[PDB]
Amino acid sequence: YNDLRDFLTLLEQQGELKRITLPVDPHLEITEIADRTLRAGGPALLFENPKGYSMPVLCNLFGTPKRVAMGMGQEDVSALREVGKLLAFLKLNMPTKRLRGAPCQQKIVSGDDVDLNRIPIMTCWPEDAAPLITWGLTVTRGPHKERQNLGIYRQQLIGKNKLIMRWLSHRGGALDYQEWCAAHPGERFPVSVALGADPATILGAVTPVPDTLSEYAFAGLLRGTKTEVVKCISNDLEVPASAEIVLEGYIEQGETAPEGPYGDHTGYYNEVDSFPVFTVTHITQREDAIYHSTYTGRPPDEPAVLGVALNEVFVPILQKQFPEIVDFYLPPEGCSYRLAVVTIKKQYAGHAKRVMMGVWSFLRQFMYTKFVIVCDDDVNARDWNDVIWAITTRMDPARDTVLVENTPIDYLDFASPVSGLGSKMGLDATNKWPGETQREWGRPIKKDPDVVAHIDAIWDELAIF
Amino acid sequence: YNDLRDFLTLLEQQGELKRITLPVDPHLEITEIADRTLRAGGPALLFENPKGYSMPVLCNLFGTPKRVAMGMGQEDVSALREVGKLLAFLKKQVLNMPTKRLRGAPCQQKIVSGDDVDLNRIPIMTCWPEDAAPLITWGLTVTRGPHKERQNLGIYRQQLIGKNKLIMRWLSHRGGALDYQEWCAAHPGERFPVSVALGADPATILGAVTPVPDTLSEYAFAGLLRGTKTEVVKCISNDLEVPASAEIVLEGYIEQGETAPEGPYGDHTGYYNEVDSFPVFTVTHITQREDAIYHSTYTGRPPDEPAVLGVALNEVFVPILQKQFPEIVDFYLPPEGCSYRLAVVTIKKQYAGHAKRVMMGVWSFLRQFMYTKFVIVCDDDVNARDWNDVIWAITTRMDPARDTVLVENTPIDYLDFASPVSGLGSKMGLDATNKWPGETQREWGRPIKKDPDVVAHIDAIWDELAIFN
Ligand SMILES: Cc1cc2c3c(c1C)C(C)(C)CC=[N+]3c1c([nH]c(=O)[nH]c1=O)N2C[C@H](O)[C@H](O)[C@H](O)COP(=O)(O)O
Ligand SMILES: Cc1cc2c3c(c1C)C(C)(C)CC=[N+]3c1c([nH]c(=O)[nH]c1=O)N2C[C@H](O)[C@H](O)[C@H](O)COP(=O)(O)O
Ligand SMILES: [Mn+2]
Ligand SMILES: [Mn+2]
Ligand code: NA
Ligand code: NA
């Protein structure tokens, strides 16, 4: 049973983990180092000597797509499509195996002894309001079913034992809380947060499984074995037995705090807003605990890289519905969800428009995607040289652009005319068939596949780089 | 005086030239290798062992903008901006800079003529699988008209159609085609002398492709880029002058009335153009160096070497645009947009609506951009040349329907089959600037700026951190 430490050893053996012994400040400096590292596609980083703390800080864990694949037990990034077919089928799944004891409860501190200032919580960007917890798996139950939701919600430090719980309203945690308030007026909402669980559990948290299903069950499928958990000390929620640190407590109904500003995955600061306060009554941890953290900012960042790997999971699901789709890609540069490029085997005049409408309606992850570019299958969706070529040689802008107004848009997207509402643009860059054009369309240059294959074979021997 | 061989030694010293000793076919395989190389921003390539020939093939010479700059003697590509300002002023007496004529030159060490001429001995490349035939792609075609002394140099592609016959595919507004057309009127039925140089020095090659006036010889502009007069030699069979340092020269004539169906050939748009008739160039002499090297390239789906050349030569217009529109910080036409079809412009925005004035300027000020169908406008925090910045701007600063300008029934290239009607089509401008009060009623986002003190500290300890190892 691989916990997180086993994963770090695996990475270190493969030159995918680097230990920093120099003094480095959790205030701003770690983010700067990790940002350079990620942008050059370097290793995961373990800062063994954070200025002013004894607990090492692990970050950039999932800063390459390879390391996301490795964290699901697979060799490479193409294996992620198979986990996508699996995800199709859930739309008996395996419960958790509850241990009687666990390393994450070796050292326990509670009540007045709780001090989150002892943890090397990072400050990411210069005008961020305060230190911010960024890799917490938040565990909740609602009042109406047994299912335990795991989510990643950022958490601002506001006291020795107070965090802000910044879940957006469509998240599992926020729905569970909202229902608890209606169904049990005035009663404290139990909550627990696990830091540094095994990678299958972490990636399971972030994969959008149904709300009906526990993210613990999915992680079991990725792992091949049941997720090992332990009952929390102060509530009936279960947390991963291998966790490095666990926070337990509750949300007092009505209690809220102004959150942020914080730099966001779009590369801008979110302005201040109110969210629930999470009161921390217990902090449990391993001997030798490692603090797992990250940051978001201008893309690409670790979330963006996670998001590119998880898009591979969705390709199969889309292809099941739309078998004409050859590839489907959401570039990191587009803030991970705002632009999609789709390639198809076009079969009839107008086909591109059906595909756009499918991207905008089929799955909710893409409901808010404001640019969609559709191309033929001779275009590599992942290369702007091909995509721009297609746009500039197969479109007449006014004929081939679809605009739709008053559509749902992310409420934090300041570029839309009104919060929550905006337009979308679809670019039909497919070759135009009779009916779509009265001109003689051009015959595109295709490569000889035998020449390509021969050059693949002798490429290393050629030794050009 | 740097000839081409000196340039290749310079490149090799800097890891910018790679010699391939493996057997490689000029039919299709070289193009494939060069294409991968260029798309990964790799070196120039010298295939020392082309399957079925003894003459090495040089390609991807100018596949990088750096190497275009190096070929003009410079560190970087901006020196072309100074040429921008110079070309402005002519609309400078010692820009009446002639050629220096040598008697004898390495390009005439080995000579072959009449029935001995066999172009099949040259490793002429076939670029794409459905191309009609092997194609000469880096020939500097030299011509004189009957009415002035000026020698025009152009690059016109030439299909192989016989042991001693090429098709001369010059479009009708080119210098060569005008010279020929005038010769026919002024000397009915007389053969039109023409010569083609392969593998000249880099300043000559780059000069050939610069858009100088028809009044001026492209040999004179190369002299300005070089700093010294272009060294030439008289041809054997005519009075035209070719670069002394050329690796190979073809001499001959066009027989009036003689034409051949040309192509299909794949071209810089990434499509095949269909068959069409052009004059036939009859080759009477082939002169060359000892150890001659064949310089070639290919055009196809961008980016290719022509596109990269085109991008470096557009730097010439930035200064001219900036004189008119000083708000413009950068102006870039990516190769992947067929070199002219999309432009990205960055500005210091000064008032609501500013992006729209700029779009209209791109579409109206200069003729080279009249036919540009997409324009993206951004602020000066965006590097116009990095799709990671440009896509970021588009996706964080636009509402698609509010911020997109479409205009219909505008001039479009007649060969752009994607427009509804030949010569007529729409254009799109994307305003991706930050929206000011008036343009939006929302509170706009404040971007994340780094602490310069943090950055500086990390620069200092970066090597000691040793993240790579
Ligand atoms: C990986 C990751 C995902 C974050 C995230 C972060 C990371 C590292 C941070 C901490 C660096 C900064 C932004 N975080 C938030 C977030 N979702 C959310 O509602 N609020 C957030 O603050 N997301 C997304 C959220 O965790 C995923 O969408 C879950 O799949 C939601 O699960 P649920 O649907 O079960 O609630
Ligand atoms: C660099 C380069 C430029 C080509 C070119 C090529 C290259 C490598 C080829 C050979 C690979 C394939 C497409 N070529 C043609 C071409 N112009 C033309 O009329 N027919 C062509 O076939 N162009 C452009 C043309 O040579 C330039 O516009 C010259 O500046 C013309 O000079 P002029 O204005 O003095 O006639
Ligand atoms: Mn969930
Ligand atoms: Mn000319
Ligand atoms: Na979740
Ligand atoms: Na020219």
mmCIF file with all atom_site columns, C-alpha atoms in Angstrom, chain A residues 226-353:
data_model
loop_
_atom_site.group_PDB
_atom_site.id
_atom_site.type_symbol
_atom_site.label_atom_id
_atom_site.label_alt_id
_atom_site.label_comp_id
_atom_site.label_asym_id
_atom_site.label_entity_id
_atom_site.label_seq_id
_atom_site.pdbx_PDB_ins_code
_atom_site.Cartn_x
_atom_site.Cartn_y
_atom_site.Cartn_z
_atom_site.occupancy
_atom_site.B_iso_or_equiv
_atom_site.pdbx_formal_charge
_atom_site.auth_seq_id
_atom_site.auth_comp_id
_atom_site.auth_asym_id
_atom_site.auth_atom_id
_atom_site.pdbx_PDB_model_num
ATOM 1   C CA . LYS A 1 226 ? -9.462  -0.082 -0.976  1.00 0.00 ? 226 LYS A CA 1
ATOM 2   C CA . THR A 1 227 ? -8.556  3.364  0.394   1.00 0.00 ? 227 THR A CA 1
ATOM 3   C CA . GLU A 1 228 ? -7.337  2.883  3.961   1.00 0.00 ? 228 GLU A CA 1
ATOM 4   C CA . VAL A 1 229 ? -8.921  5.383  6.373   1.00 0.00 ? 229 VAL A CA 1
ATOM 5   C CA . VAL A 1 230 ? -9.163  6.189  10.086  1.00 0.00 ? 230 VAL A CA 1
ATOM 6   C CA . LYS A 1 231 ? -12.065 7.700  12.042  1.00 0.00 ? 231 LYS A CA 1
ATOM 7   C CA . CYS A 1 232 ? -11.476 11.279 13.070  1.00 0.00 ? 232 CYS A CA 1
ATOM 8   C CA . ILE A 1 233 ? -11.044 11.927 16.769  1.00 0.00 ? 233 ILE A CA 1
ATOM 9   C CA . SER A 1 234 ? -13.714 14.604 17.133  1.00 0.00 ? 234 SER A CA 1
ATOM 10  C CA . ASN A 1 235 ? -16.277 13.493 14.520  1.00 0.00 ? 235 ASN A CA 1
ATOM 11  C CA . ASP A 1 236 ? -17.520 10.549 12.443  1.00 0.00 ? 236 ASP A CA 1
ATOM 12  C CA . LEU A 1 237 ? -15.709 11.599 9.238   1.00 0.00 ? 237 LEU A CA 1
ATOM 13  C CA . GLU A 1 238 ? -12.941 9.356  7.919   1.00 0.00 ? 238 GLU A CA 1
ATOM 14  C CA . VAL A 1 239 ? -9.561  10.610 6.712   1.00 0.00 ? 239 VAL A CA 1
ATOM 15  C CA . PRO A 1 240 ? -6.765  8.799  4.910   1.00 0.00 ? 240 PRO A CA 1
ATOM 16  C CA . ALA A 1 241 ? -4.656  6.772  7.355   1.00 0.00 ? 241 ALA A CA 1
ATOM 17  C CA . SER A 1 242 ? -1.421  7.751  5.564   1.00 0.00 ? 242 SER A CA 1
ATOM 18  C CA . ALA A 1 243 ? -2.108  11.563 5.794   1.00 0.00 ? 243 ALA A CA 1
ATOM 19  C CA . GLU A 1 244 ? 0.822   13.701 6.982   1.00 0.00 ? 244 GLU A CA 1
ATOM 20  C CA . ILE A 1 245 ? -1.383  16.283 8.761   1.00 0.00 ? 245 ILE A CA 1
ATOM 21  C CA . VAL A 1 246 ? -5.099  16.425 9.575   1.00 0.00 ? 246 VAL A CA 1
ATOM 22  C CA . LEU A 1 247 ? -7.168  19.377 10.752  1.00 0.00 ? 247 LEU A CA 1
ATOM 23  C CA . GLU A 1 248 ? -10.482 18.645 12.553  1.00 0.00 ? 248 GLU A CA 1
ATOM 24  C CA . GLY A 1 249 ? -13.197 21.032 13.631  1.00 0.00 ? 249 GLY A CA 1
ATOM 25  C CA . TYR A 1 250 ? -16.426 22.632 12.603  1.00 0.00 ? 250 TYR A CA 1
ATOM 26  C CA . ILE A 1 251 ? -18.126 25.565 10.942  1.00 0.00 ? 251 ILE A CA 1
ATOM 27  C CA . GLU A 1 252 ? -20.187 27.638 13.328  1.00 0.00 ? 252 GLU A CA 1
ATOM 28  C CA . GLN A 1 253 ? -23.439 28.556 11.526  1.00 0.00 ? 253 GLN A CA 1
ATOM 29  C CA . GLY A 1 254 ? -23.538 32.239 10.472  1.00 0.00 ? 254 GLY A CA 1
ATOM 30  C CA . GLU A 1 255 ? -19.815 32.885 11.156  1.00 0.00 ? 255 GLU A CA 1
ATOM 31  C CA . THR A 1 256 ? -18.084 34.350 8.135   1.00 0.00 ? 256 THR A CA 1
ATOM 32  C CA . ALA A 1 257 ? -14.976 36.348 7.293   1.00 0.00 ? 257 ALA A CA 1
ATOM 33  C CA . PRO A 1 258 ? -13.772 38.531 4.377   1.00 0.00 ? 258 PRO A CA 1
ATOM 34  C CA . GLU A 1 259 ? -11.525 36.348 2.238   1.00 0.00 ? 259 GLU A CA 1
ATOM 35  C CA . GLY A 1 260 ? -8.564  37.582 0.194   1.00 0.00 ? 260 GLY A CA 1
ATOM 36  C CA . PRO A 1 261 ? -7.631  39.264 -2.069  1.00 0.00 ? 261 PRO A CA 1
ATOM 37  C CA . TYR A 1 262 ? -5.770  36.268 -3.488  1.00 0.00 ? 262 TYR A CA 1
ATOM 38  C CA . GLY A 1 263 ? -4.032  35.733 -6.806  1.00 0.00 ? 263 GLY A CA 1
ATOM 39  C CA . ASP A 1 264 ? -5.919  33.207 -8.892  1.00 0.00 ? 264 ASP A CA 1
ATOM 40  C CA . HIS A 1 265 ? -5.373  30.734 -11.738 1.00 0.00 ? 265 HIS A CA 1
ATOM 41  C CA . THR A 1 266 ? -6.319  33.465 -14.245 1.00 0.00 ? 266 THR A CA 1
ATOM 42  C CA . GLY A 1 267 ? -3.241  35.483 -13.231 1.00 0.00 ? 267 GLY A CA 1
ATOM 43  C CA . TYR A 1 268 ? -5.308  38.225 -11.534 1.00 0.00 ? 268 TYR A CA 1
ATOM 44  C CA . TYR A 1 269 ? -6.256  38.901 -7.917  1.00 0.00 ? 269 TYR A CA 1
ATOM 45  C CA . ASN A 1 270 ? -9.789  37.941 -6.807  1.00 0.00 ? 270 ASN A CA 1
ATOM 46  C CA . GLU A 1 271 ? -11.248 40.906 -4.875  1.00 0.00 ? 271 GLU A CA 1
ATOM 47  C CA . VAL A 1 272 ? -12.494 40.413 -1.217  1.00 0.00 ? 272 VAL A CA 1
ATOM 48  C CA . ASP A 1 273 ? -15.516 38.265 -0.532  1.00 0.00 ? 273 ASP A CA 1
ATOM 49  C CA . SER A 1 274 ? -17.154 36.549 2.501   1.00 0.00 ? 274 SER A CA 1
ATOM 50  C CA . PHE A 1 275 ? -16.912 32.819 3.243   1.00 0.00 ? 275 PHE A CA 1
ATOM 51  C CA . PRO A 1 276 ? -17.575 30.498 6.155   1.00 0.00 ? 276 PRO A CA 1
ATOM 52  C CA . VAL A 1 277 ? -15.063 30.225 9.015   1.00 0.00 ? 277 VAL A CA 1
ATOM 53  C CA . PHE A 1 278 ? -13.629 26.817 9.898   1.00 0.00 ? 278 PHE A CA 1
ATOM 54  C CA . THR A 1 279 ? -12.734 26.557 13.564  1.00 0.00 ? 279 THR A CA 1
ATOM 55  C CA . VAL A 1 280 ? -9.926  24.076 14.187  1.00 0.00 ? 280 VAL A CA 1
ATOM 56  C CA . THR A 1 281 ? -10.260 22.021 17.370  1.00 0.00 ? 281 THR A CA 1
ATOM 57  C CA . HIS A 1 282 ? -7.623  19.372 16.615  1.00 0.00 ? 282 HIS A CA 1
ATOM 58  C CA . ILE A 1 283 ? -4.413  18.992 14.613  1.00 0.00 ? 283 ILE A CA 1
ATOM 59  C CA . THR A 1 284 ? -3.126  15.451 14.181  1.00 0.00 ? 284 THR A CA 1
ATOM 60  C CA . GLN A 1 285 ? 0.071   14.433 12.388  1.00 0.00 ? 285 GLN A CA 1
ATOM 61  C CA . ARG A 1 286 ? 2.826   11.991 11.739  1.00 0.00 ? 286 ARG A CA 1
ATOM 62  C CA . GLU A 1 287 ? 6.177   11.938 13.378  1.00 0.00 ? 287 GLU A CA 1
ATOM 63  C CA . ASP A 1 288 ? 8.368   13.737 10.796  1.00 0.00 ? 288 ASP A CA 1
ATOM 64  C CA . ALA A 1 289 ? 5.367   15.363 9.140   1.00 0.00 ? 289 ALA A CA 1
ATOM 65  C CA . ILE A 1 290 ? 5.786   16.931 5.690   1.00 0.00 ? 290 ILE A CA 1
ATOM 66  C CA . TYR A 1 291 ? 3.604   19.857 4.685   1.00 0.00 ? 291 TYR A CA 1
ATOM 67  C CA . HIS A 1 292 ? 2.214   19.526 1.142   1.00 0.00 ? 292 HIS A CA 1
ATOM 68  C CA . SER A 1 293 ? 1.477   22.838 -0.603  1.00 0.00 ? 293 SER A CA 1
ATOM 69  C CA . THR A 1 294 ? 1.186   24.603 -3.941  1.00 0.00 ? 294 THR A CA 1
ATOM 70  C CA . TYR A 1 295 ? 0.090   27.895 -5.510  1.00 0.00 ? 295 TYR A CA 1
ATOM 71  C CA . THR A 1 296 ? -2.065  29.184 -8.344  1.00 0.00 ? 296 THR A CA 1
ATOM 72  C CA . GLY A 1 297 ? -1.218  32.043 -10.599 1.00 0.00 ? 297 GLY A CA 1
ATOM 73  C CA . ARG A 1 298 ? -0.691  32.990 -14.165 1.00 0.00 ? 298 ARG A CA 1
ATOM 74  C CA . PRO A 1 299 ? -0.754  29.744 -16.080 1.00 0.00 ? 299 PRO A CA 1
ATOM 75  C CA . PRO A 1 300 ? 0.883   27.379 -16.308 1.00 0.00 ? 300 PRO A CA 1
ATOM 76  C CA . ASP A 1 301 ? 0.789   26.293 -12.640 1.00 0.00 ? 301 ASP A CA 1
ATOM 77  C CA . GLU A 1 302 ? 0.300   22.914 -10.935 1.00 0.00 ? 302 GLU A CA 1
ATOM 78  C CA . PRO A 1 303 ? -3.492  23.148 -11.149 1.00 0.00 ? 303 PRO A CA 1
ATOM 79  C CA . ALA A 1 304 ? -3.293  23.817 -14.845 1.00 0.00 ? 304 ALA A CA 1
ATOM 80  C CA . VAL A 1 305 ? -1.050  20.787 -15.338 1.00 0.00 ? 305 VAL A CA 1
ATOM 81  C CA . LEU A 1 306 ? -3.443  18.644 -13.320 1.00 0.00 ? 306 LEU A CA 1
ATOM 82  C CA . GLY A 1 307 ? -6.204  20.004 -15.537 1.00 0.00 ? 307 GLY A CA 1
ATOM 83  C CA . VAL A 1 308 ? -4.395  18.995 -18.759 1.00 0.00 ? 308 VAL A CA 1
ATOM 84  C CA . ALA A 1 309 ? -3.869  15.471 -17.533 1.00 0.00 ? 309 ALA A CA 1
ATOM 85  C CA . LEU A 1 310 ? -7.514  15.231 -16.462 1.00 0.00 ? 310 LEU A CA 1
ATOM 86  C CA . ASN A 1 311 ? -8.702  16.420 -19.860 1.00 0.00 ? 311 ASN A CA 1
ATOM 87  C CA . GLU A 1 312 ? -7.248  13.167 -21.181 1.00 0.00 ? 312 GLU A CA 1
ATOM 88  C CA . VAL A 1 313 ? -9.665  11.428 -18.914 1.00 0.00 ? 313 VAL A CA 1
ATOM 89  C CA . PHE A 1 314 ? -12.610 13.255 -20.603 1.00 0.00 ? 314 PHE A CA 1
ATOM 90  C CA . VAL A 1 315 ? -11.682 12.596 -24.218 1.00 0.00 ? 315 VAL A CA 1
ATOM 91  C CA . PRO A 1 316 ? -13.155 9.051  -24.190 1.00 0.00 ? 316 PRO A CA 1
ATOM 92  C CA . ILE A 1 317 ? -16.343 10.294 -22.530 1.00 0.00 ? 317 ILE A CA 1
ATOM 93  C CA . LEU A 1 318 ? -16.822 12.896 -25.222 1.00 0.00 ? 318 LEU A CA 1
ATOM 94  C CA . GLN A 1 319 ? -15.927 10.340 -27.942 1.00 0.00 ? 319 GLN A CA 1
ATOM 95  C CA . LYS A 1 320 ? -18.607 7.943  -26.699 1.00 0.00 ? 320 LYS A CA 1
ATOM 96  C CA . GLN A 1 321 ? -21.181 10.644 -27.241 1.00 0.00 ? 321 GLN A CA 1
ATOM 97  C CA . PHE A 1 322 ? -19.553 12.169 -30.324 1.00 0.00 ? 322 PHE A CA 1
ATOM 98  C CA . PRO A 1 323 ? -17.575 9.532  -32.136 1.00 0.00 ? 323 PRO A CA 1
ATOM 99  C CA . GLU A 1 324 ? -16.575 12.025 -34.809 1.00 0.00 ? 324 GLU A CA 1
ATOM 100 C CA . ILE A 1 325 ? -14.285 13.705 -32.256 1.00 0.00 ? 325 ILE A CA 1
ATOM 101 C CA . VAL A 1 326 ? -10.656 12.721 -32.830 1.00 0.00 ? 326 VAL A CA 1
ATOM 102 C CA . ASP A 1 327 ? -9.111  15.019 -30.202 1.00 0.00 ? 327 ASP A CA 1
ATOM 103 C CA . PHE A 1 328 ? -10.267 17.545 -27.615 1.00 0.00 ? 328 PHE A CA 1
ATOM 104 C CA . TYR A 1 329 ? -7.793  19.903 -25.876 1.00 0.00 ? 329 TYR A CA 1
ATOM 105 C CA . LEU A 1 330 ? -8.063  22.834 -23.411 1.00 0.00 ? 330 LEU A CA 1
ATOM 106 C CA . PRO A 1 331 ? -4.739  24.683 -23.514 1.00 0.00 ? 331 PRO A CA 1
ATOM 107 C CA . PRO A 1 332 ? -3.255  25.825 -20.161 1.00 0.00 ? 332 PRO A CA 1
ATOM 108 C CA . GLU A 1 333 ? -2.767  29.336 -21.649 1.00 0.00 ? 333 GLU A CA 1
ATOM 109 C CA . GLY A 1 334 ? -6.520  29.734 -21.767 1.00 0.00 ? 334 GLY A CA 1
ATOM 110 C CA . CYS A 1 335 ? -6.787  29.512 -17.957 1.00 0.00 ? 335 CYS A CA 1
ATOM 111 C CA . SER A 1 336 ? -7.387  25.781 -18.369 1.00 0.00 ? 336 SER A CA 1
ATOM 112 C CA . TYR A 1 337 ? -11.117 25.905 -19.272 1.00 0.00 ? 337 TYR A CA 1
ATOM 113 C CA . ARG A 1 338 ? -11.797 29.070 -21.261 1.00 0.00 ? 338 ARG A CA 1
ATOM 114 C CA . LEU A 1 339 ? -10.717 27.830 -24.704 1.00 0.00 ? 339 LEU A CA 1
ATOM 115 C CA . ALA A 1 340 ? -11.045 24.398 -26.280 1.00 0.00 ? 340 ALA A CA 1
ATOM 116 C CA . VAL A 1 341 ? -9.763  23.089 -29.596 1.00 0.00 ? 341 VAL A CA 1
ATOM 117 C CA . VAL A 1 342 ? -11.688 20.111 -31.055 1.00 0.00 ? 342 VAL A CA 1
ATOM 118 C CA . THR A 1 343 ? -10.771 18.023 -34.122 1.00 0.00 ? 343 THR A CA 1
ATOM 119 C CA . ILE A 1 344 ? -13.331 15.913 -36.015 1.00 0.00 ? 344 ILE A CA 1
ATOM 120 C CA . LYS A 1 345 ? -13.881 13.604 -38.969 1.00 0.00 ? 345 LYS A CA 1
ATOM 121 C CA . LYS A 1 346 ? -16.378 15.827 -40.672 1.00 0.00 ? 346 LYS A CA 1
ATOM 122 C CA . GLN A 1 347 ? -19.264 13.889 -42.259 1.00 0.00 ? 347 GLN A CA 1
ATOM 123 C CA . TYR A 1 348 ? -21.753 16.575 -43.509 1.00 0.00 ? 348 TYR A CA 1
ATOM 124 C CA . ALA A 1 349 ? -22.260 20.296 -44.108 1.00 0.00 ? 349 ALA A CA 1
ATOM 125 C CA . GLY A 1 350 ? -22.787 22.127 -40.841 1.00 0.00 ? 350 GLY A CA 1
ATOM 126 C CA . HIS A 1 351 ? -21.165 19.441 -38.712 1.00 0.00 ? 351 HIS A CA 1
ATOM 127 C CA . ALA A 1 352 ? -18.882 21.803 -36.860 1.00 0.00 ? 352 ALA A CA 1
ATOM 128 C CA . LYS A 1 353 ? -21.907 23.639 -35.357 1.00 0.00 ? 353 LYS A CA 1
#
